[PDB]
Enzyme design. Structure first.
Site, PDB file in Angstrom:
ATOM      1  N   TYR A   1       0.828  -1.198   0.000  1.00  0.00           N
ATOM      2  CA  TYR A   1       0.000   0.000   0.000  1.00  0.00           C
ATOM      3  C   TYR A   1       0.866   1.253   0.000  1.00  0.00           C
ATOM      4  O   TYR A   1       0.649   2.169  -0.802  1.00  0.00           O
ATOM      5  CB  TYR A   1      -0.944   0.005   1.238  1.00  0.00           C
TER       6      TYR A   1
HETATM    7  N1  LIG Z   1      -7.989   7.567   6.310  1.00  0.00           N
HETATM    8  C1  LIG Z   1      -6.626   7.817   6.589  1.00  0.00           C
HETATM    9  O1  LIG Z   1      -6.215   7.620   7.706  1.00  0.00           O
HETATM   10  C2  LIG Z   1      -5.722   8.253   5.469  1.00  0.00           C
HETATM   11  C3  LIG Z   1      -4.418   8.638   5.807  1.00  0.00           C
HETATM   12  C4  LIG Z   1      -3.533   8.909   4.756  1.00  0.00           C
HETATM   13  C5  LIG Z   1      -4.008   8.909   3.451  1.00  0.00           C
HETATM   14  N2  LIG Z   1      -5.305   8.575   3.156  1.00  0.00           N
HETATM   15  C6  LIG Z   1      -5.703   8.630   1.825  1.00  0.00           C
HETATM   16  O2  LIG Z   1      -6.840   9.521   1.743  1.00  0.00           O
HETATM   17  C7  LIG Z   1      -7.726   9.086   0.757  1.00  0.00           C
HETATM   18  C8  LIG Z   1      -9.113   8.956   1.343  1.00  0.00           C
HETATM   19  O3  LIG Z   1      -9.026   7.991   2.395  1.00  0.00           O
HETATM   20  P1  LIG Z   1     -10.402   7.511   3.085  1.00  0.00           P
HETATM   21  O4  LIG Z   1     -10.030   7.012   4.430  1.00  0.00           O
HETATM   22  O5  LIG Z   1     -11.436   8.547   2.974  1.00  0.00           O
HETATM   23  O6  LIG Z   1     -10.746   6.200   2.211  1.00  0.00           O
HETATM   24  P2  LIG Z   1     -12.212   5.675   1.681  1.00  0.00           P
HETATM   25  O7  LIG Z   1     -12.018   4.273   1.296  1.00  0.00           O
HETATM   26  O8  LIG Z   1     -13.226   6.044   2.701  1.00  0.00           O
HETATM   27  O9  LIG Z   1     -12.528   6.601   0.381  1.00  0.00           O
HETATM   28  C9  LIG Z   1     -11.938   6.284  -0.833  1.00  0.00           C
HETATM   29  C10 LIG Z   1     -13.081   6.310  -1.877  1.00  0.00           C
HETATM   30  O10 LIG Z   1     -12.473   6.007  -3.095  1.00  0.00           O
HETATM   31  C11 LIG Z   1     -13.481   5.201  -3.916  1.00  0.00           C
HETATM   32  N3  LIG Z   1     -12.721   4.540  -4.962  1.00  0.00           N
HETATM   33  C12 LIG Z   1     -11.715   3.686  -4.808  1.00  0.00           C
HETATM   34  N4  LIG Z   1     -11.281   3.253  -5.991  1.00  0.00           N
HETATM   35  C13 LIG Z   1     -12.035   3.917  -6.915  1.00  0.00           C
HETATM   36  C14 LIG Z   1     -12.051   3.869  -8.302  1.00  0.00           C
HETATM   37  N5  LIG Z   1     -11.183   3.032  -9.072  1.00  0.00           N
HETATM   38  N6  LIG Z   1     -12.911   4.656  -8.935  1.00  0.00           N
HETATM   39  C15 LIG Z   1     -13.800   5.426  -8.298  1.00  0.00           C
HETATM   40  N7  LIG Z   1     -13.834   5.458  -6.924  1.00  0.00           N
HETATM   41  C16 LIG Z   1     -12.924   4.708  -6.298  1.00  0.00           C
HETATM   42  C17 LIG Z   1     -14.021   4.381  -2.936  1.00  0.00           C
HETATM   43  O11 LIG Z   1     -15.353   3.853  -3.299  1.00  0.00           O
HETATM   44  C18 LIG Z   1     -14.184   5.241  -1.641  1.00  0.00           C
HETATM   45  O12 LIG Z   1     -15.412   5.842  -1.453  1.00  0.00           O
HETATM   46  C19 LIG Z   1      -7.112   7.741   0.184  1.00  0.00           C
HETATM   47  O13 LIG Z   1      -6.369   8.158  -1.047  1.00  0.00           O
HETATM   48  C20 LIG Z   1      -6.286   7.308   1.157  1.00  0.00           C
HETATM   49  O14 LIG Z   1      -5.171   6.528   0.641  1.00  0.00           O
HETATM   50  C21 LIG Z   1      -6.177   8.221   4.165  1.00  0.00           C
HETATM   51  O1  LIG Z   2      -1.316   7.285   8.023  1.00  0.00           O
HETATM   52  C1  LIG Z   2      -1.607   6.646   6.980  1.00  0.00           C
HETATM   53  O2  LIG Z   2      -1.138   7.024   5.884  1.00  0.00           O
HETATM   54  C2  LIG Z   2      -2.520   5.444   7.002  1.00  0.00           C
HETATM   55  O3  LIG Z   2      -3.247   5.547   8.255  1.00  0.00           O
HETATM   56  C3  LIG Z   2      -4.176   4.417   8.395  1.00  0.00           C
HETATM   57  O4  LIG Z   2      -3.476   3.249   8.430  1.00  0.00           O
HETATM   58  P1  LIG Z   2      -3.131   2.488   9.815  1.00  0.00           P
HETATM   59  O5  LIG Z   2      -2.008   3.146  10.537  1.00  0.00           O
HETATM   60  O6  LIG Z   2      -2.962   1.050   9.484  1.00  0.00           O
HETATM   61  O7  LIG Z   2      -4.492   2.807  10.643  1.00  0.00           O
HETATM   62  P2  LIG Z   2      -5.448   1.823  11.518  1.00  0.00           P
HETATM   63  O8  LIG Z   2      -5.993   0.749  10.654  1.00  0.00           O
HETATM   64  O9  LIG Z   2      -6.373   2.734  12.158  1.00  0.00           O
HETATM   65  O10 LIG Z   2      -4.401   1.093  12.504  1.00  0.00           O
HETATM   66  C4  LIG Z   2      -3.793   1.938  13.493  1.00  0.00           C
HETATM   67  C5  LIG Z   2      -3.045   1.026  14.503  1.00  0.00           C
HETATM   68  O11 LIG Z   2      -3.956   0.146  15.104  1.00  0.00           O
HETATM   69  C6  LIG Z   2      -3.532  -1.313  14.884  1.00  0.00           C
HETATM   70  N1  LIG Z   2      -4.789  -2.039  14.688  1.00  0.00           N
HETATM   71  C7  LIG Z   2      -5.605  -1.761  13.645  1.00  0.00           C
HETATM   72  C8  LIG Z   2      -6.785  -2.423  13.418  1.00  0.00           C
HETATM   73  C9  LIG Z   2      -7.165  -3.391  14.359  1.00  0.00           C
HETATM   74  O12 LIG Z   2      -8.215  -4.024  14.208  1.00  0.00           O
HETATM   75  N2  LIG Z   2      -6.346  -3.644  15.377  1.00  0.00           N
HETATM   76  C10 LIG Z   2      -5.183  -2.988  15.602  1.00  0.00           C
HETATM   77  O13 LIG Z   2      -4.460  -3.232  16.522  1.00  0.00           O
HETATM   78  C11 LIG Z   2      -2.696  -1.254  13.790  1.00  0.00           C
HETATM   79  O14 LIG Z   2      -1.723  -2.339  13.923  1.00  0.00           O
HETATM   80  C12 LIG Z   2      -1.994   0.126  13.829  1.00  0.00           C
HETATM   81  O15 LIG Z   2      -0.838   0.108  14.634  1.00  0.00           O
HETATM   82  C13 LIG Z   2      -5.156   4.432   7.240  1.00  0.00           C
HETATM   83  O16 LIG Z   2      -5.898   3.225   7.451  1.00  0.00           O
HETATM   84  C14 LIG Z   2      -4.487   4.390   5.942  1.00  0.00           C
HETATM   85  O17 LIG Z   2      -5.551   4.544   4.964  1.00  0.00           O
HETATM   86  C15 LIG Z   2      -3.583   5.578   5.911  1.00  0.00           C
HETATM   87  O18 LIG Z   2      -2.947   5.654   4.629  1.00  0.00           O
END
Ligand SMILES: NC(=O)c1ccc[n+]([C@@H]2O[C@H](COP(=O)([O-])OP(=O)(O)OC[C@H]3O[C@@H](n4cnc5c(N)ncnc54)[C@H](O)[C@@H]3O)[C@@H](O)[C@H]2O)c1
Ligand SMILES: O=C(O)[C@H]1O[C@H](OP(=O)(O)OP(=O)(O)OC[C@H]2O[C@@H](n3ccc(=O)[nH]c3=O)[C@H](O)[C@@H]2O)[C@H](O)[C@@H](O)[C@@H]1O
Ligand SMILES: NC(=O)c1ccc[n+]([C@@H]2O[C@H](COP(=O)([O-])OP(=O)(O)OC[C@H]3O[C@@H](n4cnc5c(N)ncnc54)[C@H](O)[C@@H]3O)[C@@H](O)[C@H]2O)c1
Ligand SMILES: O=C(O)[C@H]1O[C@H](OP(=O)(O)OP(=O)(O)OC[C@H]2O[C@@H](n3ccc(=O)[nH]c3=O)[C@H](O)[C@@H]2O)[C@H](O)[C@@H](O)[C@@H]1O
Lengths: 299, 299
Positions: free
Chosen positions: A133
């Protein structure tokens, strides 16, 4: 001009659409899933890899590219789809943006491009992702910057590396959402490892404000900016805080660490402060309460 | 153990197979194209995305991963295939290497991960690729390093960033091959831009020696190393040198620069000298003569 948001049905995208419309902007929303139920809103339903993207971008000056498959852990075993959604779709979108004359593209990148660093992760550090990822988000941001660098492109890219975003509406596969269900509804959550891992948890309202600032700042070419708080909290501490706020014992079970998860994230917050005037306002205890309250009302 | 070379039918791979066999190593060669006509040689014909890679890796201790689609310029318009060959195949290979217990994987990466830098390109510089090809090679090397970092992996990765390789057998889409045909056979070559762009041209014999040193050095974990000469020469200077060596006027026509081509490459050669004991031995005038002579005999 009008603004197009990809991934607009998702967690961060839906909040962004709301704020863009509230601020008076006409929004075109693109997602393959339905949108949740002053500026206008046009919902374009479809896959970025199938839609006529140039047609979707007519009259669009600014694109917020948030669509992706976002989970760290499934990326080892779903890699073709992660490539298709996170890298190929990005390339198709950027080519369409060059053809349609879009002026600014803000790309959601990720702290997972840094990999497993102790202490502060700065935009001048070499990316060393530890999950597939993270590699796909690095490739998406690098591709976006390559398109902005083309001599025929009149566009700038803001690549925003968000740090673990939470709040009302958080995706249900993320830790805080699962932990809240394990507390309010007693649905058990597994802790992956010993819980001492840390994250810089950033509230979605601050992420949307940073996104809005990228929609508005004067053009100074392309930029790569961390969007986080600079404070990291451990998984075990989030569990304790949730128990304290609710007076309910979270239903947890410790299990094995998951390969690809980094041990700690912490953003260096200085460049976004300099370039956008952005500093996060919401700390974890206040933000966690917002998410708990929203989830109660949502159940 | 035995050694497996992917991309073994290609330019660099075929020279590597020859040297590995000459040094006494049993070689398993994998390519979807046929191999050209002391250690044994087993030819496995097929696509990395279709073969049973774990089966191909039985008894393999060291993998040289050279298969890819390698052209900078077609990558804008052939991006699905570049992703499939350069990124997806790499992920499948690395997973298979973890499952098969391979000890060392040497991955061909590329100076195109640096993008458009003036002067010396060092392994501590942030990658900023300017072509989709460069993004795919960055993703392949970053993925390989993510697999080596897994806690269940007992493998190290050597990611070698080669700089514009030439010599006997050079791929026919590369500049020096085309220019030699424009000279010996009068088949016109287009110069893309004004010819003042520069490359660090590295002879294939030096690249194969660096590869052999990665097959042999003591294990000190994973590494990212430039393989080049540290001297850059302009396209126009290569044309002049070729005219001088042959007493024939190269048939050239200047045309438009191609978006995605960087203006200059120059390797920092220090880390490969420290880690492998590698310094390139062949300069361009000697090497160009080797390629001209080989091409004459080949026609
Ligand atoms: N949530 C976090 O903690 C976090 C942190 C860092 C980066 N991001 C990035 O921010 C963005 C938004 O994250 P999010 O948590 O809102 O994720 P999310 O999964 O809630 O939203 C992503 C959306 O993209 C749509 N999508 C995916 N592939 C598609 C495609 N081929 N065509 C059209 N739609 C498509 C999905 O249906 C979904 O609604 C992502 O790019 C993610 O990598 C998220
Ligand atoms: O900062 C980012 O860029 C990433 O942050 C999150 O990724 P992640 O850190 O894996 O977030 P969580 O899934 O919320 O996990 C956070 C922590 O909780 C742990 N975890 C997660 C899920 C769970 O069920 N149990 C658990 O212990 C994970 O090991 C991790 O250390 C988002 O899910 C990604 O989309 C994003 O890109
Ligand atoms: N030639 C250079 O100047 C240079 C410089 C830097 C890096 N590299 C890298 O070195 C490597 C070798 O380059 P080369 O010039 O010898 O290229 P090449 O095209 O001559 O060899 C690559 C080989 O890979 C095979 N291949 C491609 N996709 C495959 C697949 N899916 N399955 C099985 N076989 C597949 C091809 O048939 C070909 O024989 C490439 O990874 C390339 O990116 C080359
Ligand atoms: O160093 C690298 O990593 C890359 O080096 C070469 O890529 P490139 O620099 O494009 O090599 P050539 O195709 O030999 O082009 C060299 C120069 O000649 C120019 N050129 C090329 C071909 C041509 O017909 N005319 C022409 O003027 C190019 O614009 C470029 O400046 C290899 O082709 C890539 O596989 C490799 O990854």
């Amino acid at each position: 001009g009008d603004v197009l948001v990809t991934g607009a049905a998702g967690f961060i995208g839906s909040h962004l659409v709301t704020e863009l419309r509230n601020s008076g902007r006409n929004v075109v929303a693109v997602d393959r899933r339905p949108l949740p139920d002053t500026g206008s809103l046009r919902e374009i339903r479809g896959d970025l890899n199938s839609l006529n993207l140039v047609d979707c971008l007519k009259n669009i000056s600014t694109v917020f590219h948030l669509a992706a498959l976002p989970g760290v852990r499934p990326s080892w075993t779903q890699f073709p789809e992660y490539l298709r959604c996170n890298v190929l779709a990005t390339q198709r979108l950027m080519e369409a943006c060059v053809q349609a004359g879009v002026e600014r593209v803000v790309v959601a990148s990720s702290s997972s491009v840094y990999g497993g660093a102790d202490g502060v992760m700065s935009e001048d550090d070499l990316p060393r992702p530890l999950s597939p990822y993270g590699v796909t988000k690095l490739a998406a941001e690098r591709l976006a910057l390559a398109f902005a660098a083309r001599g025929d492109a009149e566009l700038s890219v803001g690549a925003l590396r968000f740090f673990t975003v939470y709040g009302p509406g958080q995706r249900p596969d993320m830790f805080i959402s699962r932990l809240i269900r394990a507390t309010l509804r007693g649905e058990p959550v597994e802790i992956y490892g010993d819980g001492t891992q840390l994250r810089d948890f950033t509230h979605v309202s601050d992420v949307v404000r940073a996104l809005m600032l990228t929609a508005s700042v004067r053009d100074r070419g392309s930029a790569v900016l961390n969007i986080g708080t600079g404070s990291a909290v451990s998984v075990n501490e989030v569990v304790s805080m949730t128990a304290e706020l609710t007076g309910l014992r979270p239903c947890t079970a410790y299990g094995s660490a998951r390969i690809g998860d980094v041990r700690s994230t912490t953003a260096d917050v200085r460049q976004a402060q300099s370039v956008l005037g952005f500093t996060a306002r919401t700390g974890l205890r206040e933000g966690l309460a917002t998410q708990i309250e929203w989830t109660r009302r949502s159940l």
